């Protein structure tokens, strides 16, 4: 029943966990608790096999642990700044080489998989700070420049015409802008990691920078110069939709250093670089 | 037109909302999806895989593989304690294990835990060990007698190198907090010598033991949250 | 969501409009209506009744 299917989504009971059955004392030469970790397989022993359990009807569900749920929350991926200090023409526009590597929180989550395929929902939170008092009428333009398209070099560059590129215009006082993007790779999935180069010489680049070119995000204050200077900070949020992930991996254990690389720093006292807390000894809980 | 009533919440941006929105790339057709081995659909698949516990993570061991092994050897006193840790899935000796790291992205947990141990001495090294789980409401056991009164497994080392101790879900409430919060503190796991570590002559007088952890069929996590096992104290640059 | 087009007039307050609105007293049950003689449903009922004309309304 596609309606029975719907009731489960509303209650979040699509993926139920198994019940615990009653077990009894045993005496046999079948020893489930014994095994060999050398095989590379996890012992599949359950509680009913080691202790005498009662019958319990499980109600827990795994819905929230699904990949869709784990990566399906908007997180910040960039904070764009347009600060008018002394030259409107030079300070009223900027650009950003798109990527999901600059903010640790969402980067770590996606990097718990080797490959991932998903659509994206971008939400923008612009905030205009009045440095001199008034803010006037702020209108912003965010333009997606795919690799190859002309990048604007002045606030009146012809590229802002956006004859083919996608642009979103936002007016101060209106709701936060938002839009969807389909899976963009030229491959079947995005590479969270890439053990490869863009050539075979000592000067070839290594890593995801080779495969994850997403283009540039160009933005500008559409409004022309005003008497009072403002500082506009636009925060970009990303969320994955219709997600699929492959080959899970160990979580990032040390701070990130740069984008597109697994490089890290290490101090003289390494225990400070990882989340592991020193134990007094083996028996001090 | 149709008379409407704008409700509270309108215009806001909730990071966990689930709305639809116009597509910036109309008519675009995504690359055909090919088959890739290893697809994961639910994080539970990752919690069911064993990973090593950095159980011997003293300050002098951290940053070394030795932080993952526990040393055993011939004892002169009977029933000596080998190790003791809290059983809380996100408590510290096991917070950095895979299941501990994932549990750290959720607020609540429930279900039984599977602890495995692999002996790494020679084939001629024998030993019997007692692995015990102490339910809450009492301090950690101070002796083997006190420990064996709780849930436990007596492990005899032999051809099969690994043993598993299941820490049954024994709680008052259906769930517990993953973060170190007394009320929902799940108890302890201690290890003691049941007999002794015996070896013939000309054989190493010490041996290592590896410890693993994973969740049973009833393991489950709830209420997604950000982790405190990783941070960012400065900009991540190009 | 459903794409909409806000029309002129939106947000205004017309004293003679006829819209619905949320109730400030949810679950409240009004007192049962009892029968009262003399109900009027239309003002025409009042125009059909004779009343005196102050025809001799000089100032004095």
């Amino acid at each position: 029943n596609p309606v029975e299917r719907y009731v489960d989504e509303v209650l979040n009971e699509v993926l139920v966990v198994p019940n615990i059955n009653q077990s009894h004392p045993t005496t046999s030469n079948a020893a489930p608790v014994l095994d060999a970790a050398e095989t590379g397989h996890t012992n599949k022993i359950q509680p009913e096999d080691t202790i005498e359990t009662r019958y319990v009807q499980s109600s827990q569900t795994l819905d929230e642990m699904s990949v869709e749920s784990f990566l399906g929350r908007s997180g910040c991926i960039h904070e764009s700044v347009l600060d008018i200090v002394d030259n409107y023409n030079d300070q009223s526009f900027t650009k950003w080489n798109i990527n999901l590597q600059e903010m640790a929180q969402i980067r770590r989550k996606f990097e718990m998989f080797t490959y991932a395929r998903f659509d994206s929902e971008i939400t923008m939170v612009p905030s205009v700070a009045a440095k001199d008092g008034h803010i006037g009428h702020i209108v912003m333009q965010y333009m997606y420049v795919p690799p190859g398209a002309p990048i604007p070099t002045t606030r009146d560059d012809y590229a802002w015409q956006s004859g083919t590129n996608a642009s979103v215009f936002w007016q101060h006082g209106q709701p936060f802008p938002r839009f969807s993007l389909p899976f963009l790779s030229i491959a079947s999935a995005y590479y969270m990691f890439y053990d490869g180069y863009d050539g075979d010489t000592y000067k070839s680049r290594y890593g995801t920078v080779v495969t994850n070119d997403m283009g540039t995000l160009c933005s500008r204050i559409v409004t022309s110069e005003q008497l009072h200077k403002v500082k506009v900070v636009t925060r970009i949020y990303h969320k994955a939709k219709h997600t699929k992930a492959w080959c899970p991996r160990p979580p990032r254990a040390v701070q990130y250093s740069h984008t597109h690389t697994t490089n890290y720093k290490l101090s003289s006292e390494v225990h400070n670089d990882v989340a592991i807390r020193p134990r007094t000894n083996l028996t001090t809980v | 037109g149709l008379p409407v009533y704008v409700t509270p919440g309108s215009g806001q941006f909730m990071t966990t909302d689930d709305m639809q929105s116009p597509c910036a790339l109309p008519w675009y057709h995504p690359t055909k999806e090919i088959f890739i081995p290893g697809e994961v659909k639910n994080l539970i698949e990752m919690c069911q895989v064993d990973t090593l516990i950095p159980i011997n993570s003293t300050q002098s061991n951290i940053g070394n593989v030795s932080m993952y092994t526990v040393t055993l050897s011939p004892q002169t006193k009977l029933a000596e304690e080998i190790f003791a840790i809290k059983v809380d899935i996100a408590s510290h000796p096991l917070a950095t294990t895979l299941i501990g790291e994932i549990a750290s992205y959720f607020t609540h947990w429930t279900g039984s835990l599977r602890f495995s141990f692999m002996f790494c001495g020679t084939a001629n090294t024998t030993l019997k060990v007692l692995l015990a789980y102490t339910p809450p409401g009492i301090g950690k056991p101070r002796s083997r007698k006190e420990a064996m009164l709780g849930t436990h497994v007596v492990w005899d080392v032999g051809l099969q190198s690994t043993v598993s101790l299941v820490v049954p879900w024994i709680s008052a409430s259906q769930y517990r907090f993953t973060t170190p919060d007394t009320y929902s503190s799940a108890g302890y796991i201690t290890c003691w010598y049941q007999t002794n570590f015996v070896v013939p002559p000309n054989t190493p007088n010490t041996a290592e033991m590896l410890c693993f952890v994973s969740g049973c069929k009833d393991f489950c996590l709830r209420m997604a949250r950000d982790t405190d096992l990783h941070k960012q104290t400065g900009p991540i640059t190009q | 969501g459903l794409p909409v087009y806000v029309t002129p007039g939106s947000g205004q307050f017309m004293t003679t409009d006829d819209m619905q609105s949320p109730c400030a007293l949810p679950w409240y049950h009004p007192t049962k209506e009892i029968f009262i003689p003399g109900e009027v449903k239309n003002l025409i009922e009042m125009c059909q009744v004779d009343t005196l004309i102050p025809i001799n309304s000089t100032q004095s």
Binding site: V3, Y6, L15, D63, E68, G72, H242 | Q20, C23, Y28 | -
Partner: peptide, 29 residues
């Protein structure tokens, strides 16, 4: 366009835009 189901409890599963990327979170399982 949307998928209407009946049993009576109808599940009007609307898709307001013409692109698949536009819809909300996917169903599980």
């Amino acid at each position: 366009g949307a998928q209407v189901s009946r049993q009576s409890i109808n599940y009007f599963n609307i898709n307001y835009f013409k692109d698949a990327a536009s819809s909300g979170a996917s169903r599980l399982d």
